[PDB]
Paper text:
The most abundant flagellar building block is the flagellin protein that assembles in a helical pattern of more than 20,000 copies to form the extracellular filament. Successful assembly of the flagellar filament relies on the FliS protein that prevents cytoplasmic aggregation of flagellin10 and guides flagellin to the cytoplasmic side of the fT3SS. At the fT3SS, the flagellin/FliS complex interacts with the cytoplasmic domain of the fT3SS transmembrane protein FlhA (FlhA-C). Therefore, FliS acts as targeting factor directing its flagellin client to the export gate of the fT3SS for subsequent secretion.
Numbering used by the authors:
A (entry chain E): 10 to 121
B (entry chain D): 45 to 304
Write the structure that this text describes.
């Protein structure tokens, strides 16, 4: 159903799925904060954190670009944890902006 | 080489699960804290209504005081509602399920957070009953006597009793409300102390994983992160083939799990 999509995706598309997934979970968490639903907020921020960690851990550190990507992922991870602790939707909008930057840029990059 | 990678992967995953556990725990504590903030606000409104009803020289018992009492009873029903409905993953946090049990300690239920990956690394949390019959003037043994809980308030009694009348005069019923406010405040403060401990635990776990993985953790403020994000975006654009080599290294099964 969605199993097929991950298995037919190119490596570039798999990464793009992760960026889009991270955005979805951040947005779900921000709505849960507005709904005063701490339980749903946390579930979605943990899922967003886990995607950022997967991206970081699958960086090829032999490639020079990885250093700056990894520094951003480390910040984004810490900022999502702080947003969970502080119930701060402004921190979520901040990280949403960075992930959108990566996502939009990655989508252009995988064109060819 | 295999022994080092296995030890490191086990350390990382242990830190990750401890952090998930601790964030789950802080989100349960926040659920209780938010509910008790509402209980506290309701109690402050009840207090205003008791002060209003104390002006018995200008208030009529069967109209004005009964009308105030009807509003107080609706507000204490809401306190009871909060105490009965507040839940995290189905656990009733505020109805006394998790209270400290002096009289029979084997009956005590605790909220347990496994905040590290090893033996004994738990925090055990109790929450008292925050229902209206459990808030008010407490006896030496922690029970509440007849007429001494928020559920027993009846401001129509002010019409026929001086303010210093035992149990039912204005002064005594106001004392019930003020003791209830102090008890809810105390419970909120105790949960806040747990939240502070969990925050420190989570931040230590994050820092430990960063040191273990040699993360670049130098970005420490919003404006710097914004600047570095624009830099990284531009380099993904300008070096697309390098970006693919750097990042396009996931396994499909991991991606499926992460998108659930």
């Amino acid at each position: 159903y969605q199993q097929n999509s991950v298995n037919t995706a190119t490596p570039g598309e798999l990464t793009l799925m992760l960026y889009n997934g991270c955005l979805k979970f951040i947005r779900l968490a921000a709505q849960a904060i507005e709904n005063d639903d701490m339980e749903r907020k946390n579930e979605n921020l943990i899922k967003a954190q886990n995607i950022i960690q997967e991206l970081n851990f699958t960086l090829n550190r032999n490639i020079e670009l990885s250093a700056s990507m990894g520094a951003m992922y480390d910040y984004m991870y810490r900022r999502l944890v702080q947003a969970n602790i502080k119930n701060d939707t402004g921190m979520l909008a901040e990280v949403e902006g960075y992930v959108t930057d990566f996502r939009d840029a990655w989508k252009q990059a995988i064109q060819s | 080489g295999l022994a080092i990678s296995e030890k490191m992967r086990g350390q990382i995953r242990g830190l990750e699960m401890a952090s998930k556990n601790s964030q789950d725990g802080i989100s349960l504590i926040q659920t209780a804290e938010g509910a008790l903030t509402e209980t506290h606000a309701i109690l402050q409104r009840v207090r205003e209504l008791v002060v209003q009803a104390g002006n018995t020289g200008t208030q009529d018992k069967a109209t004005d005081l009964q009308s105030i009492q009807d509003e107080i009873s609706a507000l204490t029903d809401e306190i009871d509602g909060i105490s009965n409905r507040t839940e995290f993953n189905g656990k009733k946090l505020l109805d006394g399920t998790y209270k400290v049990d002096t009289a029979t300690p084997a009956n005590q239920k605790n909220l347990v957070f496994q905040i590290g990956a090893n033996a004994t690394q738990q925090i055990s949390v109790n929450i008292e009953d925050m229902g209206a019959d459990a808030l008010g003037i407490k006896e030496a043994d922690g029970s509440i006597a007849a007429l001494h809980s928020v559920n027993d308030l009846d401001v129509t009694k002010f019409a026929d009793n001086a303010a210093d009348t035992a149990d039912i005069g204005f002064d005594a019923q106001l004392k019930v409300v003020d003791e209830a406010i102090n008890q809810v405040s105390s419970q909120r403060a105790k949960l806040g102390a747990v939240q502070n401990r969990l925050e420190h635990t989570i931040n230590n776990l994050s820092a430990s994983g960063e040191n273990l993985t040699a993360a670049e953790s130098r970005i420490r403020d919003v404006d710097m992160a914004k600047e570095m994000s624009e830099f990284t975006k531009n380099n993904i654009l300008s070096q697309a083939s390098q970006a693919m080599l750097a990042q396009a290294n996931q396994q499909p099964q991991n991606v499926l799990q992460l998108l659930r």
